[PDB]
């Protein structure tokens, strides 16, 4: 029973970690779009 409890506890931590990872992934995605846009803007500026 104790072991089971421990496992359960671990699971929550794991879940939290996963959530964090997803958040980070989202952030990364957001950044990438900006970079894509930003590069284009830079190019435009150069042209001008």
């Amino acid at each position: 029973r104790d072991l089971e409890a421990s496992i359960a506890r671990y699971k929550e931590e794991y879940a939290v970690l996963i959530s964090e990872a997803q958040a980070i992934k989202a952030d990364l995605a957001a950044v990438e779009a900006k970079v894509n846009r930003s590069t284009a803007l830079l190019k435009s500026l150069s042209a001008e």
């Binding site: 072991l3 089971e4 421990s6 496992i7 671990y10």
Partner: peptide
């Protein structure tokens, strides 16, 4: 997983 295995054993 390890914990689960242990539980199974015991």
């Amino acid at each position: 997983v390890k914990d689960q295995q242990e539980a199974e054993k015991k």
